[PDB]
Symmetry: C2
């Protein structure tokens, strides 16, 4: 419960260790509130005090002004480190909102694989599902056993957007099913994944409009939706937290 | 992919078995679409053909007119069976929208424990979180081991709204934490639940406005939120599918 007043005094006293200790374990939304209530110079300073695992989350929560100001201020390495750790859809959201030359130097701060990822995601139309989606889903093969699937989920879990739905893909990565995480812990560990499939699923197109993601998510009452290309290959997922934001970006735009 | 045309012919032929076979494994939203495109007499007839485990889901998806017409038409036992199987928040949604004497005979069709449940949930203010919430969450004790928690989740899973977040409560059922299901499958089965708690959580009040559920869910990017009473006792949960509906009931009401 550290206030704008207490941080600004600690800054004035150059009590940098006390600041970093005071920021430990604060929820990212609460850190985003503090950074907003600060003035630009101190907001930039407190942001750099954060561990990079925290500051990437907080960055995604900031307003456009604070976000843009913060981009105008961090160094090349600090920026490079934010772009690496941002979730791919959050990385896209920044690049579509920034001016061209700024997005372009940002792009040059990405690693080759991250450049290819970011290039692909910005390449879907604006207001498309492809541009809302993240490729950090967890997928399993139909021929794996449930125990093997569970070891894959455990290895890959925290590095991924969500594990609450697990996707099944074939060898050519085409989407076969969408399974709740619970199905794997209710099932017999020696059963194949194919034993717990129903073979029916809802999926979006990457070229769907963002509002279709809202309509489809309301229709089927799911918290995550897979996105497939024209051949049925799984290319990413969209999650309910981002879809709720779309619902009220689109709602106010109607007003 | 059974159409309004094919069902109406089967009805005219009195091919009731063929109808029940044609409805097997159709997603509830697709059944709700078919029932809407029908006329009232056939919609009521096809609804009764459904297994009660299906028809309860479909009922929650229907429009107010079709829903109300269907209440005017099912028998006392058929109504009794719908009210039992409806999720408690979906049961509330029907009772707050129906006229008084109709809600009152409905109430008399409930079992004692279901009457006490429904009475309590309608007793929160209209437009409150209490009236959005369902008590069908899954909770564990902090002193249980992860293996014991996992057996409780398995016993209680499909009878509950979601298992994607598991709540920790003490002996007096006060909320101690909110844990992702993944935490239990990553953890050592012999660890206590208290070993995987962080002891911090977001919770709503039952007397919060429905729009606060929207604001809090957007703020913390969660798919489920617990609801606590003034003493901190867990009383229910709200889920993102219902909150997305609130967001656009409230959005259009602004327009
Ligand atoms: Mg994110
Ligand atoms: Mg548009
Ligand atoms: Mg990555
Ligand atoms: Mg819905
Ligand atoms: Mg996201
Ligand atoms: Mg519009
Ligand atoms: Mg429901
Ligand atoms: Mg209101
Ligand atoms: Mg019940
Ligand atoms: Mg949010
Ligand atoms: Mg519900
Ligand atoms: Mg309003």
């Amino acid at each position: 419960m550290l206030t704008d007043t207490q941080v600004k005094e600690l800054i004035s006293q150059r009590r940098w260790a006390d600041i970093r200790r005071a920021l430990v374990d604060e929820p990212p939304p609460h850190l985003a509130d503090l950074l907003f209530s600060l003035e630009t110079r101190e907001m930039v300073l407190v942001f750099r005090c954060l561990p990079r695992e925290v500051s990437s989350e907080v960055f995604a929560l900031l307003g456009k002004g604070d976000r843009n100001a913060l981009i105008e201020a961090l160094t090349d390495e600090e920026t490079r480190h934010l772009l690496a750790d941002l979730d791919p859809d959050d990385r896209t959201d920044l690049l579509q909102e920034l001016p061209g030359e700024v997005t372009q130097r940002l792009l040059n701060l990405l690693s080759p694989a991250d450049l290819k990822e970011a290039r692909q995601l910005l390449g879907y139309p604006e207001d498309s599902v492809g541009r809302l989606m993240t490729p950090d889903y967890v997928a399993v093969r139909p021929g794996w056993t449930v125990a093997q699937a569970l070891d894959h989920i455990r290895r890959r879990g925290t590095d991924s957007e969500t594990i609450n739905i697990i996707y099944v893909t074939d060898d050519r990565w085409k989407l076969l099913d969408a399974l709740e995480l619970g199905a794997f812990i209710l099932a017999d560990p020696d059963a194949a994944v194919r034993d717990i499939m129903k073979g029916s699923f809802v999926a979006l197109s990457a070229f769907d409009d963002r509002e279709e993601a809202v309509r489809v998510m309301q229709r089927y009452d799911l918290f995550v939706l897979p996105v497939v290309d024209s051949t049925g290959v799984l290319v990413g997922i969209v999650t309910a937290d981002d879809i709720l934001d779309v619902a009220q970006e689109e709602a106010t735009e109607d007003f």
